Design an enzyme around this catalytic site. Structure first.
Site, PDB file in Angstrom:
ATOM      1  N   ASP A  30       0.760  -1.246   0.000  1.00  0.00           N
ATOM      2  CA  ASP A  30       0.000   0.000   0.000  1.00  0.00           C
ATOM      3  C   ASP A  30       0.797   1.307   0.000  1.00  0.00           C
ATOM      4  O   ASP A  30       0.575   2.156  -0.861  1.00  0.00           O
ATOM      5  CB  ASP A  30      -1.000   0.001   1.158  1.00  0.00           C
ATOM      6  N   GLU A  78      -9.527  -2.599   3.040  1.00  0.00           N
ATOM      7  CA  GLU A  78      -9.301  -2.270   4.439  1.00  0.00           C
ATOM      8  C   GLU A  78     -10.504  -1.511   4.980  1.00  0.00           C
ATOM      9  O   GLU A  78     -10.882  -1.663   6.141  1.00  0.00           O
ATOM     10  CB  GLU A  78      -8.036  -1.425   4.587  1.00  0.00           C
TER      11      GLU A  78
HETATM   12 MG   LIG Z   1      -2.280  -1.126   4.469  1.00  0.00          MG
END
Ligand SMILES: [Mg+2]
Ligand SMILES: Nc1ncnc2c1ncn2[C@@H]1O[C@H](COP(=O)(O)OP(=O)(O)OC[C@H]2O[C@@H]([n+]3cccc(C(=O)O)c3)[C@H](O)[C@@H]2O)[C@@H](O)[C@H]1O
Length: 255
Positions: free
Chosen positions: A51, A161
């Site tokens: 990420d 997420e």
């Molecule tokens: Mg992450």
């Protein structure tokens, strides 16, 4: 179905074009900076993982283009390493991103100080709570840097997420702009591949599901009923994380 409702809320798509999404995020950042010309820096915490490496590459690309296009030599991307004490992946990530500036702030001293103050008051933290405390110290650091460099804090939050609320409230969830929002985990990998990111940079039990289960769900695929229930349970439980503080006007928590 709740699945269709969640997918819409998070803006997830079954399939995406890597290059097209890369441009969508970069153009987004460029447009924001041109609308708020007092912003001179993009601040992002780098951890050497998928990420933050993807977000970091996009941020530098946005800054690179804006410089050439506007001629403003003062714009810059600031990558911030925030280690807790004492990781060759971070160096590799940096080499891949080629950030304008890299600042290293060790948050251990501050975290131990916060814990000592709490201990003396009568509050001992569990390793779990200490983890969120670390996330919030990282938020604090990045905001102090943004405040001194006329910048904004870039977040790495994405659909995979957001759906489970797998982030610290006002910790890594505390950001100004999130260019990855809408993408699921595997799609994030697609973008990195398209950017030629070294494979090892993008290649935990907390959830009762795997990332493949989450991505499949977000892509609208038929998953085992109990997996769907687990995912939806997390979604419903963490709605408070994806909304501003609760007021007497809110009724979402009443359903
Ligand atoms: Mg992450
Ligand atoms: N346009 C924009 N789009 C997206 N993000 C933007 C942004 N502009 C700034 N930001 C972000 O927000 C940051 C600035 O906001 P912030 O950190 O709040 O900084 P700031 O807005 O200056 O907040 C400080 C003000 O609040 C007052 N305050 C604070 C706390 C308690 C009390 C009290 O009376 O008890 C008063 C303080 O006295 C001062 O007047 C920027 O550094 C950047 O990270």
């Amino acid at each position: 179905t709740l699945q269709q409702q969640i997918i819409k809320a998070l803006g997830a798509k079954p399939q995406i074009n890597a290059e097209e999404e890369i441009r969508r995020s970069v153009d987004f950042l460029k447009s924001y900076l041109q609308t708020y010309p007092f912003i001179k820096s993009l601040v992002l915490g780098i951890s050497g993982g998928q990420d933050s490496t993807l977000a970091g590459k996009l941020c530098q690309m946005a800054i690179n283009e804006l410089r050439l296009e506007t001629g403003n030599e003062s714009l810059q991307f600031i990558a911030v390493r925030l280690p807790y004490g004492v990781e060759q992946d971070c160096q590799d990530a940096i080499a891949f991103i080629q950030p304008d500036r890299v600042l290293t702030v060790n948050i251990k001293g501050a975290v131990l100080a916060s814990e000592q103050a709490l201990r003396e008051a009568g509050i001992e933290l569990s390793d779990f709570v200490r983890g969120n405390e670390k996330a919030r110290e990282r938020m604090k650091a990045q905001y102090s840097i943004a405040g001194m460099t006329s910048g904004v804090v870039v977040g790495t939050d994405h659909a995979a997420e957001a759906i489970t609320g797998f982030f610290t409230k006002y910790g890594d969830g505390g950001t100004d702009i999130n260019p990855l929002y809408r993408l699921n985990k595997r799609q994030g990998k697609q973008l990195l591949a398209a950017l030629a990111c070294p494979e090892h940079l993008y290649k935990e039990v907390a959830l009762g599901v795997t990332y493949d289960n989450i991505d499949d769900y977000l892509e609208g695929k038929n998953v085992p009923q109990q997996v769907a229930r687990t995912i939806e349970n997390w979604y419903l439980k963490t709605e408070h994380k994806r909304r501003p503080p609760i007021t007497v006007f809110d009724d979402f928590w009443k359903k």
